[PDB]
mmCIF file of C-alpha atoms and ligand atoms in Angstrom:
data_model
loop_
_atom_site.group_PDB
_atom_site.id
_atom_site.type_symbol
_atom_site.label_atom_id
_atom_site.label_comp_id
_atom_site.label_asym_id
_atom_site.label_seq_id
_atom_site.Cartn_x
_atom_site.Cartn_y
_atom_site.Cartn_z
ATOM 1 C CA UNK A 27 -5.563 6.932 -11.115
ATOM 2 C CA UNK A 28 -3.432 5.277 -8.222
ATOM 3 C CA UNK A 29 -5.133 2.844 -5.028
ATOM 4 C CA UNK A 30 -3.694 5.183 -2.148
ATOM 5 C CA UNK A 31 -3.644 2.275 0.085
ATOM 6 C CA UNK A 32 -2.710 -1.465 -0.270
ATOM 7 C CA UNK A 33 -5.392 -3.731 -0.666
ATOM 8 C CA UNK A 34 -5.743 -6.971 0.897
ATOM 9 C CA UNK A 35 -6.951 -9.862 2.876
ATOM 10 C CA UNK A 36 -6.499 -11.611 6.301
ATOM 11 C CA UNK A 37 -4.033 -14.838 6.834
ATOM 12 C CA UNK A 38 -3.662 -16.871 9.384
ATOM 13 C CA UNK A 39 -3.281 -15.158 13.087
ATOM 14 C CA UNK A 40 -4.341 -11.799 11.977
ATOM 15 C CA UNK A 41 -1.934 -11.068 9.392
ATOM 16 C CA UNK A 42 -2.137 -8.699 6.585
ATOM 17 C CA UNK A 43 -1.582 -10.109 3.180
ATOM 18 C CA UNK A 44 -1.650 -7.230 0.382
ATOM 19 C CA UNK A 45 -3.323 -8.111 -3.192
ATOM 20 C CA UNK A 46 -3.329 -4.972 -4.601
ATOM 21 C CA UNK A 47 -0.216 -2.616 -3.508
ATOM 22 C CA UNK A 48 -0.155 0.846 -2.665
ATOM 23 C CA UNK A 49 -0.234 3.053 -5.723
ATOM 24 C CA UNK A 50 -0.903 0.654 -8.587
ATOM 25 C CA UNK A 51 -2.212 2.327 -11.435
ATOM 26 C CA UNK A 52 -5.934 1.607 -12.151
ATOM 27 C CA UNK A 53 -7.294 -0.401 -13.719
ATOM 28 C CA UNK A 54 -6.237 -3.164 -11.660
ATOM 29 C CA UNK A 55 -6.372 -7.098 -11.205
ATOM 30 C CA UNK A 56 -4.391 -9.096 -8.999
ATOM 31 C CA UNK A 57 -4.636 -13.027 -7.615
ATOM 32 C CA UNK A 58 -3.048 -15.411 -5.357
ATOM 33 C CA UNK A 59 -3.388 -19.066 -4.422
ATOM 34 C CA UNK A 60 -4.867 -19.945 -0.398
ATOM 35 C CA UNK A 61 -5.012 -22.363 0.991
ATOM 36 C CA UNK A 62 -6.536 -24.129 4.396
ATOM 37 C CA UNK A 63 -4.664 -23.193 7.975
ATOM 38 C CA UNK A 64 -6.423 -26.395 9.740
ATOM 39 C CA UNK A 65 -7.251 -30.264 8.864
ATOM 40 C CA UNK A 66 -10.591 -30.532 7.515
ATOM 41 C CA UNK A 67 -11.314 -26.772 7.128
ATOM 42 C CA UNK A 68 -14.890 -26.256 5.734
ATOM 43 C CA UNK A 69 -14.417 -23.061 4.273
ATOM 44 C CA UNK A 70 -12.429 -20.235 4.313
ATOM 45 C CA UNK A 71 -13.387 -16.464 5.941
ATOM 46 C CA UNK A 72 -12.416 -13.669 3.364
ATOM 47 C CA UNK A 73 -11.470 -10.580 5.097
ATOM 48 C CA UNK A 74 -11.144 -7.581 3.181
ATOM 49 C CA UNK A 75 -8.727 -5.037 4.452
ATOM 50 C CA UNK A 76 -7.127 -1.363 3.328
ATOM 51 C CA UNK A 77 -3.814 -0.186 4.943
ATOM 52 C CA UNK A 78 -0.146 -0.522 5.223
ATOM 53 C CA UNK A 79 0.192 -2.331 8.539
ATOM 54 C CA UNK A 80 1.687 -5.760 9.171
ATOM 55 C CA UNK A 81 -1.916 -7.319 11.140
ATOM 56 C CA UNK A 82 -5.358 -6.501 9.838
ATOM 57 C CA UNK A 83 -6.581 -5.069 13.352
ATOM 58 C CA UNK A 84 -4.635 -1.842 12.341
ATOM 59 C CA UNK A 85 -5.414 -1.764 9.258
ATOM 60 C CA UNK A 86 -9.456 -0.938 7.853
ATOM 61 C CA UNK A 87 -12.108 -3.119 7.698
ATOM 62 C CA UNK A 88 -13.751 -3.296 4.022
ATOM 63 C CA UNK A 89 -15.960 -6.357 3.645
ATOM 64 C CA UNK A 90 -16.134 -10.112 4.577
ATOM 65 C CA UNK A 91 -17.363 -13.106 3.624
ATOM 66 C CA UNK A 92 -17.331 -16.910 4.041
ATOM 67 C CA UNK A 93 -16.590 -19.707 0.867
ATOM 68 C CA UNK A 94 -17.803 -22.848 2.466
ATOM 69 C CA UNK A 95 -18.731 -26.407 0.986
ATOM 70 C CA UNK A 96 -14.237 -27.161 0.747
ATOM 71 C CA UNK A 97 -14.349 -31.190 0.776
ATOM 72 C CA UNK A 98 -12.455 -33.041 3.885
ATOM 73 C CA UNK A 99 -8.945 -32.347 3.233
ATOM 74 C CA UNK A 100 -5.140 -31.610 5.254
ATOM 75 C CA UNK A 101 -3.992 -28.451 5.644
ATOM 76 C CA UNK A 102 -2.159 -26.990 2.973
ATOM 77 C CA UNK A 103 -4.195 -28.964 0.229
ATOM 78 C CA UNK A 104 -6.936 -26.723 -0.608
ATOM 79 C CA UNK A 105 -6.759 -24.709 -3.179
ATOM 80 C CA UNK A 106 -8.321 -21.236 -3.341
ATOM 81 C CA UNK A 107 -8.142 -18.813 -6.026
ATOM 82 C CA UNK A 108 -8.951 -14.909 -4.831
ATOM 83 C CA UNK A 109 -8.821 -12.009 -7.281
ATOM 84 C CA UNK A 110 -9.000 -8.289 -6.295
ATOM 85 C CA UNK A 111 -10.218 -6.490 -9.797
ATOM 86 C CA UNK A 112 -10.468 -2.499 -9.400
ATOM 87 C CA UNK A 113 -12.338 -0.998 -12.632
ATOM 88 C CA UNK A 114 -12.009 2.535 -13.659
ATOM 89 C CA UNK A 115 -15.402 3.401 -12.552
ATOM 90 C CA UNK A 116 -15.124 2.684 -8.847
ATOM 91 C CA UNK A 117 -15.570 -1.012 -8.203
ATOM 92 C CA UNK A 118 -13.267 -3.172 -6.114
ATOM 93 C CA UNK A 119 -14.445 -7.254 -6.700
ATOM 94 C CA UNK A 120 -13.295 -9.584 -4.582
ATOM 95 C CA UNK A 121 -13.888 -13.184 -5.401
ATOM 96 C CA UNK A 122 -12.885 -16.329 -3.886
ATOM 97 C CA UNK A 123 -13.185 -19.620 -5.999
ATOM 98 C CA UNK A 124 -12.155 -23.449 -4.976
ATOM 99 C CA UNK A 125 -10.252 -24.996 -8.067
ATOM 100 C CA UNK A 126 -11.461 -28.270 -6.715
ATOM 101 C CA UNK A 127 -14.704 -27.865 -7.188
ATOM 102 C CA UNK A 128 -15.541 -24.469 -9.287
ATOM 103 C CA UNK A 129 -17.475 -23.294 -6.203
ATOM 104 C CA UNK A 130 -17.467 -19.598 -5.529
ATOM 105 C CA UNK A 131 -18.196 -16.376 -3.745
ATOM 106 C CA UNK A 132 -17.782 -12.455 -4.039
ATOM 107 C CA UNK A 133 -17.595 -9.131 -2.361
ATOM 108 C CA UNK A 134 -18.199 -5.756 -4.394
ATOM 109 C CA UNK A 135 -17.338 -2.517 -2.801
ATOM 110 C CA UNK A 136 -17.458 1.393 -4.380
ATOM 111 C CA UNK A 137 -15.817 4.157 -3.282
ATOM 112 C CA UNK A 138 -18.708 6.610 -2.333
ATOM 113 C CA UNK A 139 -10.903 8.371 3.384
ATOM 114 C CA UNK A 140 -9.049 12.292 3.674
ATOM 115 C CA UNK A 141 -5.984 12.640 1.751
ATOM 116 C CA UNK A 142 -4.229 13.680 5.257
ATOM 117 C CA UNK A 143 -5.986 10.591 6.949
ATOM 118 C CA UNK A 144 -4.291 8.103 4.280
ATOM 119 C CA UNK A 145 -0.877 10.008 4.698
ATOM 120 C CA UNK A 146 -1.233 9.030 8.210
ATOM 121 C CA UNK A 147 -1.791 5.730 8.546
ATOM 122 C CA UNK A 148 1.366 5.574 6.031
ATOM 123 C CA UNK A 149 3.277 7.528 8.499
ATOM 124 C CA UNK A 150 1.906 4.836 10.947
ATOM 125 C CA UNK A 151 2.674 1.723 9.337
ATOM 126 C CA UNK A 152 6.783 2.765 9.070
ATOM 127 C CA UNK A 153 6.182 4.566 12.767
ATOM 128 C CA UNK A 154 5.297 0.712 13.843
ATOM 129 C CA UNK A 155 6.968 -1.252 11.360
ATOM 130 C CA UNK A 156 9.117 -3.460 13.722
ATOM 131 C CA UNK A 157 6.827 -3.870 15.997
ATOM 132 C CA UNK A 158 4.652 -5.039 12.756
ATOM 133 C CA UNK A 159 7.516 -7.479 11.535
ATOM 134 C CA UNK A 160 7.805 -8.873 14.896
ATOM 135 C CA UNK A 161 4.150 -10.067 15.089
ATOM 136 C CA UNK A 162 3.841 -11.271 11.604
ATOM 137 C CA UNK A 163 7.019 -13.473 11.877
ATOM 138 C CA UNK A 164 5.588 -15.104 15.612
ATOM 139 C CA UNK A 165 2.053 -15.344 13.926
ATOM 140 C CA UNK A 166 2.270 -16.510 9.947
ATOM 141 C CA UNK A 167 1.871 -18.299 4.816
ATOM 142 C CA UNK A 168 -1.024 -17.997 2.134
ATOM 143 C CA UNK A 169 -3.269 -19.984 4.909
ATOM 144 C CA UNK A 170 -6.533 -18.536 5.428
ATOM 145 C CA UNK A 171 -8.790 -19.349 8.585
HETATM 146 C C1 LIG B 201 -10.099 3.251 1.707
HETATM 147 C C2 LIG B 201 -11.479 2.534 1.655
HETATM 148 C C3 LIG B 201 -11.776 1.864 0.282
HETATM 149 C C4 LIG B 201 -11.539 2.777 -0.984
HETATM 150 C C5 LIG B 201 -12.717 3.825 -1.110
HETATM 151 C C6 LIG B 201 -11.611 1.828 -2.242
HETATM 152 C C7 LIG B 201 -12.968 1.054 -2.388
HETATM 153 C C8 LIG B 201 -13.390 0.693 -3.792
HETATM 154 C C9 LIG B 201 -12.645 0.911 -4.885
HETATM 155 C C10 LIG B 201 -13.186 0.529 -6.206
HETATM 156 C C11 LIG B 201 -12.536 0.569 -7.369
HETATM 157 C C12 LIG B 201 -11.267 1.540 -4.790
HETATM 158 C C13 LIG B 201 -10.253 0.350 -4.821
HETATM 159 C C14 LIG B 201 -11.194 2.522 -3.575
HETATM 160 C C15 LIG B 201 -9.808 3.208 -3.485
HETATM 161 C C16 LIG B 201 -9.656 4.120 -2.227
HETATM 162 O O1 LIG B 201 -10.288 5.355 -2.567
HETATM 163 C C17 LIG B 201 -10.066 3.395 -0.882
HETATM 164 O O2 LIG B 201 -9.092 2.310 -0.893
HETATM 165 C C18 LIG B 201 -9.775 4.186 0.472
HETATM 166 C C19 LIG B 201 -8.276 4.647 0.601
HETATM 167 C C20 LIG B 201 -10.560 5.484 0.653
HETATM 168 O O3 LIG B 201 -10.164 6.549 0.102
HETATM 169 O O4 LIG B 201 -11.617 5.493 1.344
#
């Protein structure tokens, strides 16, 4: 019915940026714009992470993978679309496209976590949540190694 945990992917310096928030109703689709954090950035590393925590280390791993062939550009220029679709039958998609080009790439994963074990790392992520805010503010904006 609900995604227990916020969805998301990594941003420059480790930071957590959340897609899909905790309990949204499924079905579910959500996108935002990326772009490049350096000057001539080949590609771009998606980073697929679960939890409620301000960095990605703390959060869970989920999937990765790379969308390369981005043209010669500054940072900041590059455009890159990513959509995180959860279906009703258990199927997160992740796909990042370049609106440059049309170029893309994408991540499935199922669901085949204890209901106690994602009430903690809610707990957790409020527990730590300064200490969170701290080190996304001296880190970070939609910039994507
Ligand atoms: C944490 C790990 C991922 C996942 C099993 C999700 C993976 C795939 C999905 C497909 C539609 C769902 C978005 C899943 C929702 C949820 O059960 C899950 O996010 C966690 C909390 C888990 O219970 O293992």
């Amino acid at each position: 019915d609900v995604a227990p945990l916020s969805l998301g992917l990594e941003t420059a310096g480790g930071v957590m940026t959340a897609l899909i928030k905790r309990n949204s109703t499924i079905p579910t689709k959500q996108t935002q714009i990326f772009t490049t954090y350096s000057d001539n950035q080949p590609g771009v590393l998606i980073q697929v992470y679960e939890g409620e925590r301000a960095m990605t280390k703390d959060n869970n791993l989920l999937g990765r993978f790379e969308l390369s062939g981005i043209p010669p550009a500054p940072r900041g220029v590059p455009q890159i679309e990513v959509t995180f679709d959860i279906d009703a039958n258990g199927i997160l998609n992740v796909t990042a496209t370049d609106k440059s080009t049309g170029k893309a790439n994408k991540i499935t994963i199922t669901n085949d976590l204890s209901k106690e074990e994602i009430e903690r790392m809610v707990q957790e992520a409020e527990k730590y949540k300064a200490e969170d805010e701290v080190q996304r503010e001296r880190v970070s904006k939609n910039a994507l190694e």
